[PDB]
Amino acid sequence: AAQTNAPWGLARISSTSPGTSTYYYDESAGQGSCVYVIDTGIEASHPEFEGRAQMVKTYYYSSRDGNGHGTHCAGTVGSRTYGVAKKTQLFGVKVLDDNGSGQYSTIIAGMDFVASDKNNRNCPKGVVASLSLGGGYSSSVNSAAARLQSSGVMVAVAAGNNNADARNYSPASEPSVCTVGASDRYDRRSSFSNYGSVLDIFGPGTDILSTWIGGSTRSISGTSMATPHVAGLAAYLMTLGKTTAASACRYIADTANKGDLSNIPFGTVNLLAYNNYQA
Numbered sequence: 001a002a003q004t005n006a007p008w009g010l011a012r013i014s015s016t017s018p019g020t021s022t023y024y025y026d027e028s029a030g031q032g033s034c035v036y037v038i039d040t041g042i043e044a045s046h047p048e049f050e051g052r053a054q055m056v057k058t059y060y061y062s063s064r065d066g067n068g069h070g071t072h073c074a075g076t077v078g079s080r081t082y083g084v085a086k087k088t089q090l091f092g093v094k095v096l097d098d099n100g101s102g103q104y105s106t107i108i109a110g111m112d113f114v115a116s117d118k119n120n121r122n123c124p125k126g127v128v129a130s131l132s133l134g135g136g137y138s139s140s141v142n143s144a145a146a147r148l149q150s151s152g153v154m155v156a157v158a159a160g161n162n163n164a165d166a167r168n169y170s171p172a173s174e175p176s177v178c179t180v181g182a183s184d185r186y187d188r189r190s191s192f193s194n195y196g197s198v199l200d201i202f203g204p205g206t207d208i209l210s211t212w213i214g215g216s217t218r219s220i221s222g223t224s225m226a227t228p229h230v231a232g233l234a235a236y237l238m239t240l241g242k243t244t245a246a247s248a249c250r251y252i253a254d255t256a257n258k259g260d261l262s263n264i265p266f267g268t269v270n271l272l273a274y275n276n277y278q279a
């Protein structure tokens with residue numbers, strides 16, 4: 001399948017060169033997989049989700065996304081126009097308030113929730129969790145992400161946006177999950193992207209167009225935007241049977257475009273997520 005005039009990040013993950021405009025992908029499109037977006041919520045009513053999104057848990061007074069961040073990330077995972085895996089099932093877990101903030105205790109509870117709740121959902125091709133969030137180093141937060149991965153969920157987490165070593169941030173620094181840095185449309189490390197040995201992979205993160213609340217769209221930037229590209233890619237590859245939740249991060253690194261990014265500090269992987277789709 002081909003989406004003409006796609007957002008640059010979708011085109012990038014289906015190309016060995018920057019600057020293309022068509023997103024090429026297998027038509028299975030992540031059908032049969034499920035991605036939990038652990039964030040500010042998801043505006044499931046957005047036409048771009050086509051009924052494939054639903055809120056399953058909130059830690060606040062409402063399940064509504066009153067911010068937009070979670071809706072944007074969910075759109076990059078699986079919206080029709082802006083998503084990597086256009087036929088996946090999206091589940092929203094609201095651990096962040098409408099200002100985009102959340103306590104670590106709540107974020108941990110949300111991860112534990114997904115590890116259990118997935119045992120109650122039909123996800124025949126497997127389960128992914130996308131965590132476009134974090135703060136300073138916490139062994140408890142890292143352990144919660146490790147538990148979620150161990151339970152059989154492909155966990156993708158944002159590296160963080162401090163132009164610093166991700167070893168000092170969580171859940172970014174948890175080795176057993178998939179830590180995602182951000183790149184721009186010219187194949188440069190995004191100006192804000194964290195780096196370091198804990199990173200597994202880079203994805204498109206500067207100027208990413210996706211869904212927003214109020215049935216809208218907008219372009220924003222962050223490792224929060226790169227993370228759902230990788231989560232959606234994992235769901236897509238799992239539906240194709242090429243990998244599993246336990247092995248998807250390594251498979252994505254195995255098959256990435258290698259050595260093509262600039263301003264990668266020595267000791268950080270130079271790997272850009274790539275779907276390797278051949279029609």
Ligand SMILES: CN(C)c1cccc(C(=O)NN)c1
Nearest residue numbers: 133134135158160169170172
């Ligand atoms: C919104 N910010 C700064 C953000 C976004 C995504 C991740 C993080 C983090 O600290 N990860 N360990 C921070």
